[PDB]
Amino acid sequence: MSTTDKIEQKVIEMVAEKLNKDKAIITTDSRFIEDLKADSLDTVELMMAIEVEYGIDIPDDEATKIKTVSDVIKYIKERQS
């Protein structure tokens, strides 16, 4: 049995709290960065909430490795020690 599976279905609640994206907007290719025009000073805390929530770390280098629903579950997965 694996718990990570719950992450693939829980991600919706994550991305919804990360960039304040409504559940009716949560999409795999959610480009909130462009559509919502997520500024830099804003992404600082917005993206930070992903570290205090998941309890992991995500440097600028991997900032684009957990932005998408498929990348967040694909990265955080292998990242989860």
Residues with catalytic function = 39
* 3-state DSSP percent of the chain in helix, strand and coil, to 5: 65, 0, 35
Tokens of 23: 């559940």
Q: Say how many C-beta atoms besides its own lie within 10 A of residue 73's C-beta.
A: 19
